[PDB]
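Q: What does the assembled structure look like for these inputs?
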Amino acid sequence: EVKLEESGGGLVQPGGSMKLSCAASGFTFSDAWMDWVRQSPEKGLEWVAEIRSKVNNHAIHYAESVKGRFTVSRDDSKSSVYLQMNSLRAEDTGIYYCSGWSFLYWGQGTLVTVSAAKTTPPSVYPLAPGSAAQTNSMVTLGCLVKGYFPEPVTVTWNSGSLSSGVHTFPAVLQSDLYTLSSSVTVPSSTWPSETVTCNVAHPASSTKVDKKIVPRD
Amino acid sequence: CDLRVLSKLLRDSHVLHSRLSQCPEVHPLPTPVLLPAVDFSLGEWKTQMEETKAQDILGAVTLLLEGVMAARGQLGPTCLSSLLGQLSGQVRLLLGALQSLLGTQLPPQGRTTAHKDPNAIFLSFQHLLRGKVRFLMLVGGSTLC
Amino acid sequence: QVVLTQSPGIMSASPGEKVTITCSASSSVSYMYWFQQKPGTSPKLWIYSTSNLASGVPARFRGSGSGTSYSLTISRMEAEDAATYYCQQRSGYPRTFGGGTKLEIKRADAAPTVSIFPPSSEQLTSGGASVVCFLNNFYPKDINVKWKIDGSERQNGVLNSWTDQDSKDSTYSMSSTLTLTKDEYERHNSYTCEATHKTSTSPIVKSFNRNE
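A:
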């Protein structure tokens, strides 16, 4: 019913500026207090900013580590809340989440990478079993996603209908390029006799649908 | 401000309810709607801590405002819905006073009954304002406002 | 500037075990709030106002405490309960959280399921050669992987990756990729991926020769 969608994240360079948006639906937005909350492995969960409702006079509060640099606002008419970020530091990196009604509702989060590097799209590769294809009961296929920046990349299999037996591995940064892989294991009668396909997405325009097929001897 | 936000709030509230006879063809909701329980046995509720009691209410006004909206949302652009609406106006003053005192919003919560009868929604409001709220405006108060 | 501290930073338990996590506050707060978070999704409200469970939260959980010391107890836990739990306080601004308790699950050993992959024909066109090797659903997490090229150790060019505890069974998985230049790939024949694990003294070996 009630949903919140952040948009506006991705790459910004240190000392840049970036604006986050959040669209609410499925409840009376001008009745909600809103909050921004960011996450990273080091600092953990850190509250950033709260903006109160019309009835609560739209009172604003900021995290200390953010005063002078981030500004928060809303448009009731548009059911939206914003985080205008300035003079971004490397430590502002992390997933950013709008949360509504004092932490009762949470969006999906957007990843904010503060780096000087620019964007590289992935090179997408099919992993098919060795040509001495040792048939058995179960068989494992993969998709190798090599040299992209920044995070994230999503991988599904067959649009999401193939979800059992998939392992997508966290990316390793290698030298300013992220490599990531996904495996799937499926009963031998399903493949190749039926098609299994990995859908790679990389926000920054990339979208590759990679058919998995046997390699010619 | 006052401990009379409750009084002018209670006042403003009969006045709208009264007007529900000016509205031709008032139909008991096509869907039963939950409302912040009309229970008159709050002796034990009195013993609980000063903030708690207020937190139970905040939770109970949130469910109410939530109730108004959902019944006004089984219903079209009528006269009921139109009136069932400046009622929402009244609920919101209360919600703001409690959220402010408490420094947070809380979730929809507490013991409930369901009602198709629009009248009883106009009523749990007046009832909350007369009990739970009142027995927590009388103990001096960290003001109410 | 109220500081929050959560006790076992990390812990494991079995289905039917009592679990108890503690939040300590730097000064007195009137209530505690809790949130649950599983990997790759958003926190959710778990407990608010110290002792009220959230929509979605099973009766086996109970929140309690006052002042300076709170806790979250599960009477007899279930697998689905494995996550990170955070306390949060709201006594003014800033809002602060504790740093989490990772509650993981404990189980019997499983050997890895191992498979090896040669470079694709499209990676080969473009000048590169990664050999990738999956070692899938094992327990515990500690595993060693040796690449052998034409029978000798290869150490350089290896990237390993682990996943978190699986949600269904409770095992762990591993990716190992050795990468090289097409040229150096094509100057050798046998590429081996060897896994040593608690489950056996003898390593599991998967290989492929370059010439079928």
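Chain B touches chain C at residues 51-52, 55, 103-104, 106-107, 109 (CB under 8 Å).
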